[PDB]
């Protein structure tokens, strides 16, 4: 579901950014936007959906809709990476185009394999 992996991400971020500089805050999307007034430094996130294809797509859509709600603080950047295995056109219409409209804004494409160009 959505909340579980949200808590995973929040726990990762907190336990990673705490020890690096040396109270407790719950696991939620308020923490990321409250990062400035807790640690003093801005933050940039990178996301890696490991197996992009074998996950529940409605849950994925709910998760991405929830994450697009934190672009109103002017002090944070993030980036998403899909590690695709089949193709872009294969699944870009499997998910609702509501998410796909904004994903056409700024993308990048790589030909990826162990035998790249011999």
């Amino acid at each position: 579901n959505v909340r579980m992996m949200l808590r995973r991400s929040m726990y990762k971020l907190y336990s990673a950014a705490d020890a690096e500089e040396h109270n407790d805050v719950s696991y939620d999307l308020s923490l990321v936007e409250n990062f400035k007034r807790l640690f003093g430094k801005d933050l940039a996130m990178v996301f890696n959906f490991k197996d992009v294809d074998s996950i529940n797509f409605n849950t994925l859509d709910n998760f991405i809709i929830l994450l697009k709600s934190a672009f109103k603080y002017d002090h944070v950047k993030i980036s998403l990476i899909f590690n695709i295995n089949t193709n872009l056109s294969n699944i870009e219409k499997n998910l609702r185009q509501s998410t796909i409209r904004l994903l056409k804004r700024n993308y990048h494409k790589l030909d990826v394999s162990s035998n790249k160009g011999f």
């Binding site: 959505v2 909340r3 949200l6 719950s26 939620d28 929830l66 904004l102």
Partner: protein, 267 residues
Amino acid sequence: MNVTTPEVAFREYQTNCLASYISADPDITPSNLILQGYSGTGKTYTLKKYFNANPNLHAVWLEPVELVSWKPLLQAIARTVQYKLKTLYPNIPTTDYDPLQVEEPFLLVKTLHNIFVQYESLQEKTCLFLILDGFDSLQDLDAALFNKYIKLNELLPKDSKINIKFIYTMLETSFLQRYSTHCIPTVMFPRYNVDEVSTILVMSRCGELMEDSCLRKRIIEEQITDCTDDQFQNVAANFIHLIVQAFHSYTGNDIFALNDLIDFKWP
């Protein structure tokens, strides 16, 4: 009470409704009210527009679109209430309680009661306003939620120098009709029409896309010294006329998708 009316172009009916509903004195404001609408109508935009029209009145803002359940709202509210109180009353002493200490509406009301009793020495009674944007857009919502939030003003003692109020916003109206027996005041924003959305866009995005880089880019890529802001606005206006005449059948009376498509295809 003297209330400066926001001279809006299309939502003056709801402007009148809310300006008559709400003022400084809590006595002439309802115990609970809803402001329902549909996406793209700018209900939230007009709420802050009316707040700009009335600066002296203040309200808290929460966006449960990101929150997932009830307890996160509890912690957020417990934080914000006292944060706003202490920020807007610097001289008052306090024993700031932990907002995380809340884990249930009972605990929330207990800590609000503590806040009020420590705020017992106010000179005049004051009622603040609360905002929950997208209360139906929650991700684990059930049907036993709204009534409990309606029931906040009852368990509160009547001798509170500081009270509060609730605001709401829904989309479907199905869950709204599921609960209408309690006879709650409500204001509605119908989905716009062709000319209404056209005017909304040509007064909202006009400046945004007029001060965009691509205009100046092309003006010197072509290298033509025959231009004026009037003609820039005219060409943008007719291009938007073409956009709407082409894709109104596609969407109709929405703004978000049109703006996205404009951003994609303008260059």
